[PDB]
Structures are given as structure tokens and as C-alpha cells.
């Protein structure tokens, strides 16, 4: 019922190999819908989902201009960050940011986001009030003081409560046949003997959207959290996701074990067992 829009910026310096590369991707929930790469032959914002293709030339012109301007902004930021940390011009560094909005089933704002990381470490973030900043260290305090003096937070608040929510709602309607369609997992349990003494029970969830899912094993009705091998949820390549959970069980005890699956697309949670 709830939904999110998020843009992801990455800038990576590469001394001796040109100017820092700038990439943007945009998501609605777990669906990538737009991309930009300054290393492309002819850099432009490009559609990656069918429902954004109908936006007109004025939309794509604005989106591309923003990304071209951002490419330069992030190069200046990288220069400033190197100085803030007394770093040499010879090293490669990464600046990332992610921003956007979360809305509930009625389309109203739940909260907004805008945060930054330098070389993989949190640097500065807009607080949930959309008015104040949290800085990680004395370098980020320089950024904070600059952004406070220029009232940047007020610009972000206006965007996050206005355009962000309004355009997310537009995208959800234009893409409703996919973005507002939960595809339930197809589930089954497989059995893999390890030795005479033990076998693996593996509980599979395939073909589901969105990626959020809960997969758990119980033994005699008690969760087996410490004994369960849980792989990261992974993309299938057709918009859907996959996941599995496995437990090692003594030979002959398989029927003490149940797999439990929760997902938005399921009419009811599933309980599964090994069915030889």
C-alpha cells in the first residue's frame, strides 16, 4: 500500500583517467525507471520502464539538464571534500547521495530523505523534520554551516512535500498495472542429503514483487534464526525477485520443520513442509 520514490547519485573521481564520472538512477519502489551516465556517448536521461516513456520532451530536457548540472556540482563537491580531509589529489574518492519521499496508501507523505556519503561513510543527512541537518564529523559541519546559511533545507522541504509526492503519485497511476501489482512468491521445499546423518531443507520463494519478503524456518514451532542460512534477496532479471532459506536437519526429523512465508501478494501467509 505504501510506496517510495528515490534518486541515487554517484560521483567517482579517477585522477589520471579524466574527470569524475557521474551516474544517476531513479526508482519507484523496487523498479528502476530512469538512468543517466556522464560516460555515455551522448549523456542523457533515459527511460528504463515503459510507463515513463510517455513523458514528453519538456520532461526529458529538464531531467537531462539537471543531471548535466549535477555532474559539475558533484565534481566541485569532490574537490571541496578532498580539502576538508587534507587528502592528496592522487587518490580516487566516491561521493554518493540518495533522496526522495515515502507515501502511504492514501498518497500522503510519510517522510522525506536526503543524505550523503563520502568514501562509503555517512557524511551529512537531512533530519526527518526536513529543517535541520546531522553532520558526521567536523568536515561535514563545514557543509552544514554552508547549507544552513543558504537555507538549503527549505528548498528540499518544498520539493519533498510537493513535487516529490505529486510526481510519485503520477508515476504510480501511469504505471499502476505493474507498480501497484504485487506478484506473490511461488514456493516449494527441496531436500538435499548431506551425509547419512543430515540433510538440507531449502525453502524457495520465486517470482515475487516487490522484494520485501519474510522467509523463516521453524522446528517444533520455534524459529530457527541462528541455524538458518538466508541468502540475500536477488533479482531474477524479469522485475521479480528470488530468495531461499535453508536448515540442516537430522535424518528422519524432516517433518518437525516448517517454512513460513509472508509477502504482500499472498492472500494468506504460507506454511510449507517437505513433501517427499
Amino acid at each position: 500500500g505504501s510506496h517510495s520514490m528515490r534518486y541515487f547519485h554517484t560521483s567517482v573521481s579517477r585522477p589520471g583517467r579524466g574527470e569524475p564520472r557521474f551516474i544517476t538512477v531513479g526508482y519507484v519502489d523496487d523498479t528502476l525507471f530512469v538512468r543517466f551516465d556522464s560516460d555515455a556517448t551522448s549523456p542523457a536521461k533515459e527511460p528504463r520502464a515503459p510507463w515513463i516513456e510517455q513523458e514528453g520532451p519538456e520532461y526529458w530536457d529538464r531531467e537531462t539538464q539537471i543531471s548535466k548540472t549535477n555532474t559539475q556540482t558533484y565534481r566541485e563537491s569532490l574537490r571541496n571534500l578532498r580539502g576538508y580531509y587534507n587528502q592528496s589529489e592522487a587518490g580516487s574518492h566516491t561521493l554518493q547521495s540518495m533522496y526522495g519521499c515515502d507515501v502511504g496508501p492514501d498518497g500522503r507523505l510519510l517522510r522525506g530523505h536526503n543524505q550523503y556519503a563520502y568514501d562509503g561513510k555517512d557524511y551529512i543527512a537531512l533530519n526527518e523534520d526536513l529543517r535541520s541537518w546531522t553532520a558526521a564529523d567536523t568536515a561535514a559541519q563545514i557543509t552544514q554551516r554552508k547549507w544552513e546559511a543558504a537555507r538549503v533545507a527549505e528548498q528540499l522541504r518544498a520539493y519533498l512535500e510537493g513535487e516529490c509526492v505529486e510526481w510519485l503519485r503520477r508515476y504510480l497511476e501511469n504505471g499502476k498495472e505493474t507498480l501497484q501489482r504485487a506478484d506473490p512468491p511461488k514456493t516449494h521445499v527441496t531436500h538435499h542429503p548431506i551425509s547419512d546423518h543430515e540433510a538440507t531443507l531449502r525453502c524457495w520463494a520465486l517470482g515475487f514483487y516487490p522484494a520485501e519478503i519474510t522467509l523463516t524456518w521453524q522446528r517444533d514451532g520455534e524459529d530457527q534464526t541462528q541455524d538458518t542460512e538466508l541468502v540475500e534477496t536477488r533479482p531474477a532479471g524479469d522485475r521479480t525477485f528470488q530468495k531461499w532459506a535453508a536448515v540442516v536437519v537430522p535424518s528422519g526429523e524432516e517433518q518437525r520443520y516448517t517454512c513460513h512465508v509472508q509477502h504482500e501478494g499472498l492472500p494468506k501467509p504460507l506454511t510449507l513442509r517437505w513433501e517427499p
Binding site: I66, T69, T73, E76, Y123, T143, E163
Partner: peptide, 9 residues
């Protein structure tokens, strides 16, 4: 739709 006023850090 992107935010158009990303500031320099």
C-alpha cells in the same frame, strides 16, 4: 521528477 537545486558540499 528530480530536484533541480542540488548544492555544492
Amino acid at each position: 521528477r528530480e530536484f533541480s537545486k542540488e548544492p555544492e558540499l
